[PDB]
Scaffold this motif. Structure first.
Motif, mmCIF file in Angstrom:
data_model
loop_
_atom_site.group_PDB
_atom_site.id
_atom_site.type_symbol
_atom_site.label_atom_id
_atom_site.label_comp_id
_atom_site.label_asym_id
_atom_site.label_seq_id
_atom_site.Cartn_x
_atom_site.Cartn_y
_atom_site.Cartn_z
ATOM 1 N N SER A 1 9.794 8.234 -28.349
ATOM 2 C CA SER A 1 10.501 9.155 -29.231
ATOM 3 C C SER A 1 11.404 10.131 -28.487
ATOM 4 C CB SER A 1 9.496 9.939 -30.081
ATOM 5 O OG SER A 1 8.704 10.793 -29.273
ATOM 6 N N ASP A 2 11.379 10.132 -27.154
ATOM 7 C CA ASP A 2 12.174 11.061 -26.361
ATOM 8 C C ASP A 2 13.513 10.458 -25.949
ATOM 9 O OD1 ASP A 2 12.880 13.353 -24.986
ATOM 10 O OD2 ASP A 2 11.430 13.096 -23.369
ATOM 11 N N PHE A 3 13.551 9.146 -25.723
ATOM 12 C CA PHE A 3 14.669 8.481 -25.058
ATOM 13 C C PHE A 3 15.554 7.706 -26.029
ATOM 14 C CE2 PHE A 3 12.169 8.350 -20.794
ATOM 15 C CZ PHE A 3 12.496 9.671 -20.575
ATOM 16 N N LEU A 4 15.804 8.251 -27.223
ATOM 17 C CA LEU A 4 16.681 7.584 -28.182
ATOM 18 C C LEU A 4 18.147 7.642 -27.768
ATOM 19 C CD1 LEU A 4 15.664 6.198 -30.848
ATOM 20 C CD2 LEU A 4 14.023 7.919 -30.033
ATOM 21 N N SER A 5 18.526 8.602 -26.923
ATOM 22 C CA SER A 5 19.914 8.760 -26.503
ATOM 23 C C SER A 5 20.195 8.160 -25.130
ATOM 24 C CB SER A 5 20.301 10.242 -26.502
ATOM 25 O OG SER A 5 19.572 10.962 -25.521
ATOM 26 N N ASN A 6 19.192 8.103 -24.251
ATOM 27 C CA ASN A 6 19.347 7.484 -22.938
ATOM 28 C C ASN A 6 19.510 5.967 -22.986
ATOM 29 O OD1 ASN A 6 19.430 9.272 -20.584
ATOM 30 N ND2 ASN A 6 17.414 10.053 -21.271
ATOM 31 N N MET A 7 19.226 5.318 -24.114
ATOM 32 C CA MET A 7 19.344 3.869 -24.192
ATOM 33 C C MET A 7 20.805 3.439 -24.266
ATOM 34 S SD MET A 7 18.186 3.077 -28.122
ATOM 35 C CE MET A 7 18.708 1.368 -28.014
HETATM 36 C C1 LIG Z 1 17.331 11.343 -20.602
HETATM 37 O O1 LIG Z 1 16.074 11.986 -20.928
HETATM 38 C C2 LIG Z 1 15.798 13.133 -20.110
HETATM 39 C C3 LIG Z 1 14.400 13.589 -20.452
HETATM 40 O O2 LIG Z 1 13.431 13.031 -19.573
HETATM 41 C C4 LIG Z 1 16.850 14.212 -20.353
HETATM 42 O O3 LIG Z 1 17.398 14.602 -19.098
HETATM 43 C C5 LIG Z 1 17.964 13.711 -21.267
HETATM 44 O O4 LIG Z 1 17.504 13.625 -22.611
HETATM 45 C C6 LIG Z 1 18.494 12.340 -20.817
HETATM 46 N N1 LIG Z 1 19.287 12.477 -19.608
HETATM 47 C C7 LIG Z 1 20.586 12.168 -19.551
HETATM 48 C C8 LIG Z 1 21.251 12.371 -18.219
HETATM 49 O O5 LIG Z 1 21.198 11.749 -20.525
#
Ligand SMILES: *[C@@H]1O[C@H](CO)[C@@H](O)[C@H](O)[C@H]1NC(C)=O
Ligand SMILES: *[C@@H]1O[C@H](CO)[C@@H](O[C@@H]2O[C@H](CO)[C@@H](O)[C@H](O[C@@H]3O[C@H](CO)[C@@H](O)[C@H](O[C@H]4O[C@H](CO)[C@@H](O)[C@H](O)[C@@H]4O)[C@@H]3O)[C@H]2NC(C)=O)[C@H](O)[C@H]1NC(C)=O
Ligand SMILES: *[C@@H]1O[C@H](CO)[C@@H](O[C@@H]2O[C@H](CO)[C@@H](O)[C@H](O[C@@H]3O[C@H](CO)[C@@H](O)[C@H](O[C@H]4O[C@H](CO)[C@@H](O)[C@H](O)[C@@H]4O)[C@@H]3O)[C@H]2NC(C)=O)[C@H](O)[C@H]1NC(C)=O
Ligand SMILES: *[C@@H]1O[C@H](CO)[C@@H](O)[C@H](O)[C@H]1NC(C)=O
Ligand SMILES: *[C@@H]1O[C@H](CO)[C@@H](O)[C@H](O)[C@H]1NC(C)=O
Ligand SMILES: *[C@@H]1O[C@H](CO)[C@@H](O)[C@H](O)[C@H]1NC(C)=O
Lengths: 47, 593, 593, 47
Positions: free
Chosen positions: B144-150
């Motif tokens: 649920s944390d990494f919806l944008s990092n994908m």
């Molecule tokens: C990826 O997730 C991390 C949380 O661990 C946070 O820095 C951010 O939401 C994302 N990082 C980048 C660089 O997009």
């Protein structure tokens, strides 16, 4: 393959190469060394 | 306990040819179920088979499938990807550029049991032939944390695959067949399921520590654990040694106190680890404390003022991204006697490297490492200059703990050197890992060392093989000094023996401590030569002295004061009530009052 | 925060008449919701009303309803009975012998919200008129451990009550009406509910820490908490300060670290409690440790060898069942300076008691309590012999912590004595509780003491009233010594002042430290008289000395050695390289080399 | 009520009594004392 700025990056006579489909750098070790840049000695098998 | 393996750390590094890397990947991941390192599937060409990867059920790092033109990779039992170390600092499942020159690479990837990646996201890039994977909804698998990092990328201009079977929800399938469908665990839950569930009914809420799924409502019915494990159950925190009392405002002793070790809650910590007051098995305590004397286990107590400047080893602490002891970090190893990590010696320190533009390491500069006495990690000696022929830096090293290990099997590696002898005369305990000494030229030096007396943990072996001749080196002074005990000897010097035959003057193996001859006046206790007080007279007929004190001389040298043998009588020594004592000698040299 | 009250400890003790006990029960349990002590409903006769008992929602002890001929006891909001201390060592809900001489006692007991007793069982005995309670199934209310400790007794030869309403499961109701039915929480659950539930549907499983019931699936929807509380949620364990790391094998700092205090997890411990390394608010640490110096909070560190013999107070530890300092336990208070509990002084020690057959306590024997310097609990001085007129035992008492309190309000009670003065000249800090000094005869002695400077916690008061005259005692030498500062004074002695006006020779309030006259040679610093070295000459014209050392004399008495003033020159003092120093005097008495 | 073996059990001029329906012993304190055997001073109300 990889440019002249990464000389000596791949240890133990391993050759440097550039992966252009991923825009990344890679090494090619000799038989007896693993690692990111040929830095880990293969201790589990064959000395 | 499941079958464990440490895996590889090869990001994109090919090992020799394609066949050599394929054999290394085959030997690394045969009969492994829990990958504590990294799952790294790289450089698998066409007409190959990867049936040995079917047994992997747990990966504690990042899964990296890159440059694989093989048709099928059966990761059918991969239930959990923990991801303790990320790829590109953001991902833990990266499938990257699987195509040949004819644009026909990876076709099927049937990850049937992949249900949740705990830490990490999904990176797919440049996969033209990879079909039946883009239809998978990745909301269930990513957290649920990494919806944008994908980040997703696909190419569907092939038209060679088929669709899913019409008996699965939302048309999601990994490959060909009804058994390859995605088992939805989170998006089909009701309002009352706090974590993940099994079906669309509200009566299928699993436990919070059930990471992938559950076979029932209890915490013992989890498939894989989220954080910790009480040996049949999955837990958030291990039960500590002391539980708080809400009635008497006290701390009562818990009979079910479990020590936290990794993802497990073991009953007791092992030998080379540290027991804390909170009930944990750690490698190092805080900065305000130090590891004190062992009472069976290792604790930590506070120091006065600041503590000792603890040197961080290679791969942990401030030197985590480092790889060798080089010209920069060697100034940090000045005045510390306990290494909280590794001491790697690589040829990159002595050959030079223009990627960082650092001067090469000096052989006399390694004397900064003279004060090293304890290594908590593993020792990797790999390079040595052709000037010195003995490891003179590790002359005071006593105990190698081996809390971290290379390949999870080895803790002391002395390989590929131009040394003559080892010189490890103070090594008394190796608590973990195997010891390999091979690939050398002028070092036989190992047939007498009883390694079982040095091994602090049972179930260990060695691979000291193929050094020099094995029958031709042993006739040219290879056998060590004749006063060494048969328990073992390291070098040909008389002081490099492990133990001595009769007596040991400091470190030298002697037959006797100068009885009836010799210049120093020494006696024997604990098979050691110990000097006496210099006012013992040298007797050539009988023995000289027994104890260290001046009362143990048989005949005094110059003056006698009762039982004591003294050079001068006390002529003004501090007494009582402002009385400096005047003492005069006798004809028998008795200092009379 | 709910309204709390400490309750009573009257097992079967009637307080005076029936009306006096009824007024005490009325004043004890008005506007109380959480009973931290014991719910004790005893001796309530006919034609009375108990509407003030409707607001009680939590009892931390045993509920004891005994000898009550009142018709109705409305315990309508009692949701949880914790039962930290049992009744007859087995029960926590005991209704015992409610009948008058005409066999008409308690009729209705509508415990509508009683759903689970955590620790304890149910004891009903000799209740002839108590109807509509025996139809309640007590399997839901008793725990799963105490199915055999329960004991039931009823008499149904009255025929004056009615049956339940036919809209409730299994015909269970507490009284007259459909609102008085038992809400079943456990026996109507499905297989998947691990603890308790709401209805017969399997989709109503509550949280484990929901003791009585739940208003939803989350842990924030619990009605009452089972063990601990994170301030809107009910928890098993409080979140500690350090969480274990399964990756790096370390102990990371938790940002959500909550300190366990009672049934709560507060953000920080209060002032007079002890912070442990586990993250708890305790009253006493282990036997191998001691409470060390305050750095803002109170910690505990290990001692060398055995620790100090810590005296257990009255009501905790080995003296838990005791009630007063008597002729037996006073030998245990020999050589301790920190009392880990209470020091109760009762008339039972000085009058005698044949129930135990012990000799009475001696007034000179209380000098064993001369070494008392710290009380963690509350002090209750209630009796004193008519010989001594001053509390000479507590002459070295410094800090009263007050970690336990009488009635939860008071920590220092000095009542009903024949003393003249108090004599508490070393009392510097009272961290908890109110201070009451009343019911005395010859003790006015309180109008100058600023209690706010001694109170370490805000929100405290005092009840020093009705002692002696309030205008007639103050003309017979009642006012203390004139050199006391107006901050306060305890007794009429010059040393019993709290602080002094100008200087304080040790403890005596003086105007100056013998400047230009007097026999001792003293100076002033920190408003104190300090003697100098005796080799200062007594000057009658100017001042004598400034500092403690011999360098601070203006003129030496007999001999001078540089800046020092000395009696004799050094004539054989230890020097360097076997040189005892001979020093001879001068005409100006300079000890020359 | 209670027999002679429990003399002085109830302090501060409180009278001893025996509850025969429960086979137990009890005290009766004066106004200003509570407790199991009249040992706790009433500090919260009226001195
Ligand atoms: C990826 O997730 C991390 C949380 O661990 C946070 O820095 C951010 O939401 C994302 N990082 C980048 C660089 O997009
Ligand atoms: C000899 O030993 C040296 C010991 O310090 C060693 O120096 C280290 O080299 C590493 C090479 O990978 C560095 O990673 C390491 O620290 C770096 O310092 C940089 C300074 O700006 C940081 O930016 C860097 O952070 C990030 O950079 C990399 C770049 O690829 C990222 O991939 C990574 O995620 C990281 O977060 C990193 O902290 C460096 N140590 C110090 C103290 O600088 C040297 O390389 C050795 N070998 C020789 C000389 O051949
Ligand atoms: C003066 O101070 C004395 C401090 O020691 C005090 O002595 C204590 O009196 C208490 C009164 O109830 C006792 O409870 C306490 O310990 C008892 O010792 C007995 C010895 O056999 C035990 O049998 C007893 O166990 C059980 O007995 C009672 C009996 O009613 C039960 O109700 C109870 O549940 C308990 O479990 C208990 O351990 C006793 N302490 C010592 C060390 O003997 C004395 O009473 C004070 N008052 C005077 C002299 O007037
Ligand atoms: C893995 O090891 C086993 C030994 O038990 C062997 O039988 C098997 O052939 C190995 N796997 C492969 C792919 O060779
Ligand atoms: C309880 O106290 C309140 C004061 O807030 C008072 O109004 C009420 O009458 C008291 N209860 C009884 C039963 O007297
Ligand atoms: C009551 O329960 C307790 C457990 O707390 C145990 O002693 C036993 O089961 C019961 N005791 C008696 C005396 O029956």
């Amino acid at each position: 393959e990889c440019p002249l700025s990464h000389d000596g990056y791949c240890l133990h006579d391993g050759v440097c190469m550039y992966i252009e489909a991923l825009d990344k750098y890679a090494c090619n070790c000799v038989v007896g060394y693993i690692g990111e840049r040929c830095q880990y000695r293969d201790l589990k098998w064959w000395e | 306990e499941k079958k464990v393996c440490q895996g590889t750390s090869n990001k994109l590094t090919q090992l020799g040819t394609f066949e050599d890397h394929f054999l290394s990947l085959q030997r690394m991941f045969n009969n492994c179920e829990v990958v504590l390192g990294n799952l790294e599937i790289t450089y698998v060409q066409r007409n190959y088979d990867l049936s040995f990867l079917k047994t992997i059920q747990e990966v504690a790092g990042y899964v990296l499938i890159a440059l694989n033109t093989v048709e099928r990779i059966p990761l059918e039992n991969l239930q959990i990807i923990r991801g303790n170390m990320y790829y590109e600092n953001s991902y833990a499942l990266a499938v990257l550029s699987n195509y040949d020159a004819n644009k026909t690479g990876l076709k099927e990837l049937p990850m049937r049991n992949l249900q949740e990646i705990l830490h990490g996201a999904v990176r797919f890039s440049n996969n033209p032939a990879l079909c039946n994977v883009e239809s998978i909804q990745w909301r269930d698998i990513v957290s649920s944390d990494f919806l944008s990092n994908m980040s997703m990328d696909f190419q569907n201009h092939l038209g060679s695959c088929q669709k899913c079977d019409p008996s699965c929800p939302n048309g999601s399938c990994w490959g060909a067949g009804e058994e390859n469908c995605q088992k939805l665990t989170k998006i089909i839950c009701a309002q009352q399921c706090s974590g993940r569930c099994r079906g669309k009914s509200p009566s299928d809420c699993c436990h919070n520590q059930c990471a992938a799924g559950c076979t029932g409502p209890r915490e013992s019915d989890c498939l894989v654990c989220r954080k910790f494990r009480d040996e049949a159950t999955c837990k958030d925190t291990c039960p500590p040694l002391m539980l708080y009392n809400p009635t008497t405002y006290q701390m009562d002793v818990n009979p079910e106190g479990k020590y936290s070790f990794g993802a497990t809650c073991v009953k007791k910590c092992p030998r080379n680890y540290v027991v804390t007051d909170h009930g944990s098995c750690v490698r190092a305590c805080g900065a305000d404390s130090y590891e004190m004397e062992e009472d069976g286990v290792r604790k930590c107590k506070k120091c006065e003022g600041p503590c000792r400047k603890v040197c961080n080893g290679i791969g942990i602490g401030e030197f985590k991204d480092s790889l060798s002891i080089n010209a920069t970090n060697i100034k940090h190893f000045k005045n510390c006697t306990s290494i909280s990590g590794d001491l790697h010696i690589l040829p990159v320190a002595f050959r030079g490297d223009s990627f960082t533009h650092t001067p090469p390491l000096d052989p006399q500069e390694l004397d900064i490492l003279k004060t090293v006495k304890e290594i908590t990690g593993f020792l990797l000696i790999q390079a040595w200059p052709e000037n010195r022929t003995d490891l003179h830096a590790f002359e005071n090293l006593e105990i190698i703990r081996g809390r971290t290990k290379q390949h999870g099997q080895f803790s002391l590696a002395v390989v590929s050197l131009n040394i003559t002898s080892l010189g490890l005369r103070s090594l008394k305990e190796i608590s973990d890992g195997d010891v390999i000494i091979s690939g050398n030229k002028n070092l036989c030096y190992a047939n007498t060392i009883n390694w079982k007396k040095l091994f602090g943990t049972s179930g260990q072996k060695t691979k000291i093989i193929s050094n020099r001749g094995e029958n031709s080196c042993k006739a040219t002074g290879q056998v060590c000094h004749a006063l060494c005990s048969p328990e073992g000897c390291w070098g040909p010097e008389p002081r490099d023996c492990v133990s001595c035959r009769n007596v040991s003057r400091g470190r030298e193996c002697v037959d006797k401590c100068n009885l009836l001859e010799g210049e120093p006046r020494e006696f024997v206790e604990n098979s050691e030569c110990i000097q006496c007080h210099p006012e013992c007279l040298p007797q050539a007929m009988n023995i000289t002295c027994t104890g260290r004190g001046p009362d143990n001389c048989i005949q005094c040298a110059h003056y006698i004061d009762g039982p004591h043998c003294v050079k001068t009588c006390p002529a003004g020594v501090m007494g009582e009530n402002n009385t400096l004592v005047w003492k005069y000698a006798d004809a028998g040299h008795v200092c009379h009052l």
